[PDB]
């Protein structure tokens, strides 16, 4: 409820102008300000080709 | 789409696509383009109840 | 019983949610009020008929009717005072105030 008794409505649809914006891939402070205090290799399998 | 932080797209006939699609209609749908050194200025409804 | 009444009908879709109608609501759809005036120059004509902008009362929608609210729609035609179908009669219409 809004300052009535309008019944107001989300529906995930209205969330496509938060998440579709071109910030979403933007990942470059994320794996690169992660990546001290480095962890050595648990034996990878399908991390490598 | 009103403040910019982030890189855009590469693909530009992406990136107009993905924009333009967002801010046809919004009440926060920014202005024609955004200026460089400004504000994105936030179109006004003519009223609010 | 007393003074008849007189109903005026509107076409509406019938895909228009009735959560509105539930309120205190505009039967032409689009809420077109001076009240709701931002003291622009003609800001009321585009309060009332910009669809490129949305309705004050219910700001996420444009409109609840598209057949009423619009100029030159349906519910336009017959009850505007400009174009008085419903003017040689003296019934009173109800919705030529809106």
């Known amino acids: ?49 | 789409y009103l403040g910019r932080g982030a890189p855009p797209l590469l693909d530009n006939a992406a990136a107009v696509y993905l924009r333009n699609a967002v801010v046809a209609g919004n009440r926060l749908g920014p202005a024609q383009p955004l200026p460089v050194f400004g504000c994105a200025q936030v179109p006004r409804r003519a009223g609010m109840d | ?98």
């Open chain 1, 1 to 49: 409820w809004g300052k009535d008794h309008q019944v107001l409505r989300l529906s995930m649809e209205n969330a496509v102008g938060t998440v579709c914006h071109p910030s979403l891939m933007n990942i470059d402070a994320a794996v690169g300000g992660v990546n001290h205090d480095p962890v050595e290799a648990a034996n990878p399998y399908g991390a490598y080709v």
């Open chain 3, 1 to 98: 019983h007393g003074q008849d009444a007189v109903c005026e009908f509107i076409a509406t879709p019938v895909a228009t949610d009735i959560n509105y109608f539930r309120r205190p609501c505009n039967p032409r759809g689009r809420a077109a009020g001076g009240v709701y005036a931002g003291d622009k120059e003609g800001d009321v004509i585009a309060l009332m008929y910009d669809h490129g902008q949305s309705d004050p009362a219910r700001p996420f929608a444009a409109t609840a009717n598209p057949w009423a609210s619009q100029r030159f729609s349906y519910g336009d035609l017959l009850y505007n005072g400009a174009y008085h179908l419903n003017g040689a009669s003296p019934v009173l219409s109800p919705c030529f105030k809106f």
